């Protein structure tokens, strides 16, 4: 039961300390060299415990003449076992003659009385020092202590990528070491006599054959381990994933009546395994873990209170991590290694325990994927998932693809708690301004949400001295407090602001909240897409629909077009003709040349008519942007949606105009005017294709995208800069 492993100036470790070990400690990270170096350090320490001639480990830097490996063992169970009066055994005395002997005979008759309260824990520290001249020495100069520590807390290494099925060395080693039977009392002559009696044509026939065989193969006598292995093999009736699972089950079962506390390290348990196989492996491990556990009402034979051995995993599969988190719960941890700026392995504990049972139960592959990440962008909304996972946009920015987009609300963020793992997995939480401040038309006054007040309270730097530079934070906090005034006049029936600008407030909030890994947008997600500079392209997109997604319904196009022209007027009744001619159809049949020309002319006339009507009904050239924004579930600068405006009875004429366009003119876009309709993906793809057709160089394309989409490109560039700043750290 180790509690601390410290490595200083060896391999890739400068000063690395590992603590709070649990049963199912899992190791993840892109720095495989760090995992290999840690395994090498552990194996070297345990080899030097057993006095094996091995090559000393290399130093991290040659400007240090000392390389230290420190192991701390929790010798609390063993001390309690050997202290009890009714444990007068040779091995128990040997344990309470080398480990718990120097700390007891040198104390008075008062210190020990405080060690029998069944509440304190005893720690044993052993340090291995490698000198510059390839000389190794220990803190305690007693080989018996080291041998006893190795026996009591053995280390097992299991490799699955290179495993030999024919050889079962770990199984037989565990069987020989973990036993409670004495095999020295077995009489070999008696066993041979019994075997001869079992198969005897005459009295004493197999004895002479055995004697001849022994004489003709006379070699060194069997050792105790060989004898017990042979006895087990003749006693039992039978000799990748299945092998490892059987070995783990055997080790768990054996360590139920023994005070030996093994340490198990398993490297890549999922190589060549189906995801269901890995999940079943973790499930079987949890089942064997829980079968031998007794808690209060759970009792009876077959259940033990013996502490379980520590198991270490090195997994690159999200399935194993997901099952470990879901099943074990509080009895597991995740260690992310990564690297440092100059180059040095780290170890950080990632949050794996959740106080919400719903989140633990609905835990899925995405949540386990978040731990195998180098940058997470947390968004509230599926529209952001559509926008930031757009393939046509990520190819132009080959640095934001390394970031993973996760949709999470406040509860999911609180459960995940990204702030716990900040230097290992950088994250940004993208939210909207509406989550900080709110506005009311009836009562013309700003209001502050509890999230904003909590952020301010977190940013109130009280209990602080005077330092240069940290003087404007208080002024910013005071301004964010006093912006709660009711002096904010709104024009255009409560849609815009007469003097106030949310851009400056959003910029100030982003500047002050950069340190809290939060980015607040000026408007909703549809605001960054439907803006003034995107009006042409967006319009073209609409035209694309009129040219692509709407086809003639009649099987004969020429006759139907002629009938409509002779029946409906081409100019005054153009809208009814367009509605009655073109419908929804995936297929795009090719018509005659004259029919194609007529259809193209009709489509161009309809596009011109809609453009003219849009430019005539609205005059400021900006109200159309707000109309389109509210059409696709957007918000105004007053933080009001179309539904909220309808419920509040504000901008009745605007709602009437929106209804007229929806039910009269832009009826074909009605299916796409809702969220989760995929209009974002289509619009981004069309815009990027058009820009690629226009601009040749990719830099020109990126500049044009920055011009048309300032906020999206700003966020992408900020995330890319954050990733590239720590690129040398979060990369193997």
């Amino acid at each position: 039961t180790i509690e601390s492993i410290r490595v200083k100036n060896l391999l890739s470790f400068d000063d690395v300390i590992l603590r709070d070990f649990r049963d199912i400690n899992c190791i993840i990270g892109r720095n495989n060299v760090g995992k290999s170096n840690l395994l090498k350090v552990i194996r070297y320490f345990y080899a030097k415990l057993e006095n094996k001639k091995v090559i000393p480990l290399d130093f991290h830097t040659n400007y240090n003449a000392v390389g230290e490996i420190t192991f701390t063992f929790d010798t609390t169970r063993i001390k309690k076992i050997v202290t009890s009066r009714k444990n007068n055994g040779r091995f128990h005395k040997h344990i309470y003659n080398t480990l718990f002997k120097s700390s007891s005979v040198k104390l008075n008759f008062e210190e020990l009385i405080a060690r029998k309260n069944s509440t304190n824990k005893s720690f044993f520290s052993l340090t291995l020092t490698i000198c510059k001249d390839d000389s190794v020495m220990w803190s305690v100069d007693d080989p018996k202590v080291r041998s006893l520590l190795a026996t009591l807390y053995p280390f097992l290494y299991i490799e699955t990528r290179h495993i030999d099925l024919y050889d079962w060395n770990p199984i037989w080693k565990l069987i020989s070491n973990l036993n409670s039977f004495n095999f020295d009392d077995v009489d070999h002559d008696e066993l041979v006599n019994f075997l001869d009696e079992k198969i005897s044509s005459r009295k004493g026939d197999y004895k002479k054959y055995i004697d001849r065989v022994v004489s003709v193969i006379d070699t060194k006598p069997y050792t105790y381990k060989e004898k017990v292995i042979n006895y087990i093999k003749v006693a039992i009736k039978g000799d990748s994933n299945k092998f490892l699972e059987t070995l783990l089950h055997l080790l768990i079962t054996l360590t139920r009546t023994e005070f030996i506390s093994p340490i198990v390290y398993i490297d890549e348990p999922e190589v060549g395994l189906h995801p269901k196989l890995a999940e079943s492996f973790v499930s079987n491990l949890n089942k064997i873990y829980s079968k031998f556990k007794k808690t209060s009402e759970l009792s009876g034979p077959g259940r033990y209170k013996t502490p379980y051995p520590n198991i270490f995993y090195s997994t690159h599969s999200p399935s194993i991590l997901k099952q470990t988190i879901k099943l074990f719960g509080k009895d597991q941890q995740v260690l992310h290694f990564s690297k440092k700026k100059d180059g040095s392995t780290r170890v950080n504990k990632i949050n794996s325990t959740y106080s919400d049972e719903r989140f633990l139960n609905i835990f899925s592959d995405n949540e386990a994927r978040l731990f195998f990440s180098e940058y997470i962008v947390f968004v509230e909304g599926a529209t952001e998932l559509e926008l930031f996972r757009n393939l046509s946009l990520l190819n132009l920015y080959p640095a934001f693809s390394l970031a993973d987009i996760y949709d999470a609300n406040e509860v999911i963020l609180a459960n995940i708690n990204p702030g716990y793992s900040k230097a290992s997995i950088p994250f940004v939480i993208i939210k909207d301004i509406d989550t900080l401040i709110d506005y009311s038309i009836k009562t013309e006054k700003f209001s502050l949400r509890p999230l904003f007040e909590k952020m301010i309270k977190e940013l109130t730097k009280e209990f602080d001295y005077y330092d240069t530079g940290f003087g404007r934070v208080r002024k910013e906090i005071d301004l964010f407090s006093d912006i709660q005034s009711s002096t904010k006049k709104h024009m255009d029936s409560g849609l815009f602001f007469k003097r106030f600008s949310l851009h400056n407030l959003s910029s100030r909030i982003n500047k002050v909240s950069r340190k809290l890994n939060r980015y607040f947008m000026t408007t909703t997600i549809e605001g960054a897409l439907i803006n003034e500079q995107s009006l042409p392209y967006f319009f073209n997109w609409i035209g694309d629909v009129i040219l692509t997604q709407m086809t003639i319904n009649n099987p004969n196009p020429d006759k139907f077009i002629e009938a409509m022209r002779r029946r409906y007027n081409i100019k005054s009744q153009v809208v009814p003709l367009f509605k009655s001619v073109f419908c929804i159809g995936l297929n795009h049949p090719v018509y005659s040349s004259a029919v194609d020309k007529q259809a193209l002319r009709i489509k161009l006339s309809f596009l011109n008519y809609l453009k003219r009507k849009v430019y005539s009904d609205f005059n400021n050239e900006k109200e159309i942007v707000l109309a389109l924004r509210l059409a696709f579930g957007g918000k105004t600068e007053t933080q009001y949606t179309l539904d909220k405006l309808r419920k509040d009875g504000e901008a009745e004429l605007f709602r009437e105009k929106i209804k007229n366009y929806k039910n009269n003119e832009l009826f074909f876009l009605e299916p796409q005017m809702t969220k989760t309709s995929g209009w974002v993906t289509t619009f981004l793809n069309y815009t990027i294709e058009k820009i690629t057709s226009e601009e040749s160089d990719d830099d020109r394309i990126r500049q044009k995208l920055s011009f048309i989409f300032p906020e999206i490109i700003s966020i992408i560039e900020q995330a890319s800069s954050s990733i590239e700043a720590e690129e040398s750290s979060l990369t193997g």
Binding site: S4, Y63, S102, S103, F124, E462, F463, Y465
Partner: protein, 366 residues
């Protein structure tokens, strides 16, 4: 790293020592009138003028040059990431403790040793014609000829901003030698500036023996360093270093503990008690906090006065916040290393609560 002529052209002397470079002018030394000679006890501190090219050169050296040269892990002072708590941490595993101090550490550093230590990291090429090299040009901004110490060479000043990094770099051979010697005998060695702390986990009298002192002196004599016998401390199972108590009951692997004695925390307890007794702030800062207004108040220019009350509020708030920062640095060190007594932890938690309450009271009063 390696610094060539072009590196010094526009990184370490981008604007200050530029006119000398172009017009074939050798970089001058530090004049007597360009430094102040402040005194505190029997110590002389050389303070370089803030508005001077040498100060800018020293800042650039400390930011770019004297920050990449490798150092020894035993040097826990003047290093980014080093602290006194990290200086005392490794000795928790030991049962016997020994403390030594190098006498006049900065004044005994020969300039030739500094030159030979900085030579590998600076290219051996002439800077200003065939008149002055690049190594001596760098050294001219680091050292200073002390008139007090006569014409004994360029002594590294005790007040220059480049002195600590240069001292830690030059004291790397000695750190390696002492660390190797202690490793051969199972002794943990840690150095803070010029205080060397040695810890022995084994039940041996090596640290209390004269042989250890003789060996340390013999090693230090290579570069001309001595150790004063006034503050040589060799103890067992407990050692106090400036109020920091390291205690290990002994054994074959027992873990020691680090705490702070009541002498170290006496001042803050006195301040809190005075605040509890509603003592006026006039005599709580001029006696306990040793901060007091000078006679040349308000720069002899204003007439409103009344700045004493706000000064005695501000400085008291600053002292309470700073000592709170000290205590929470201690508790964070405990969280990182787990080598601090639990009772001391709860005591400092209570003291932190009291300090927070008193700060809140003071801010409410203002």
């Amino acid at each position: 790293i390696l610094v060539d002529k072009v590196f010094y052209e526009k990184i370490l002397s981008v604007e200050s020592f530029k006119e000398n470079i172009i017009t074939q002018s050798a970089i001058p030394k530090i004049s007597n009138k360009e430094v102040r000679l402040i005194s505190s006890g029997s110590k002389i501190f050389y303070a370089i003028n803030n508005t001077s090219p040498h100060s800018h050169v020293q800042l650039r050296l400390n930011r770019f040059f004297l920050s990449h040269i490798p150092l020894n892990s035993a040097a826990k002072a003047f290093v980014r990431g080093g602290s006194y708590l990290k200086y005392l941490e490794p000795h928790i595993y030991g049962s016997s403790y020994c403390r030594l101090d190098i006498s006049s550490f900065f004044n005994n550093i020969s300039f030739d040793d500094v030159k030979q230590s900085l030579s590998p990291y600076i290219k051996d090429e002439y800077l200003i014609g065939t008149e002055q090299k690049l190594i001596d040009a760098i050294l001219n901004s680091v050292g200073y000829e002390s008139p007090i110490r006569k014409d004994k060479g360029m002594i590294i000043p005790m007040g220059f901003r480049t002195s600590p990094a240069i001292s830690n770099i030059v004291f790397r051979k000695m750190d390696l030698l002492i660390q190797d010697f202690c490793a051969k005998k199972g002794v943990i060695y840690s150095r803070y500036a010029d205080d060397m702390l040695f810890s022995n986990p084994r039940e041996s009298k090596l640290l209390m023996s004269d042989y250890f002192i003789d060996e340390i002196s013999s090693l230090l004599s290579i570069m001309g360093f001595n150790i004063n016998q006034s503050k040589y401390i060799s103890r067992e199972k407990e050692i106090s270093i400036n109020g920091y108590v390291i205690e290990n009951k002994g054994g074959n692997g027992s873990i020691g503990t680090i705490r702070l004695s009541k002498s170290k925390l006496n001042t803050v307890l006195k301040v809190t008690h005075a605040l509890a007794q509603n003592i006026p702030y006039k005599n709580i800062c001029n006696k306990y906090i040793k901060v007091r207004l000078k006679e040349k108040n308000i720069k002899y220019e204003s007439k409103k006065d009344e700045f004493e009350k706000k000064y005695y509020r501000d400085q008291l708030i600053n002292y309470l916040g700073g000592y709170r920062s000290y205590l929470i640095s201690l508790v964070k060190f405990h969280s990182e290393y787990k080598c601090v007594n639990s009772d001391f932890i709860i005591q400092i938690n209570g003291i932190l609560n009291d300090i927070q309450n008193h700060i809140q009271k003071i801010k409410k009063n203002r």
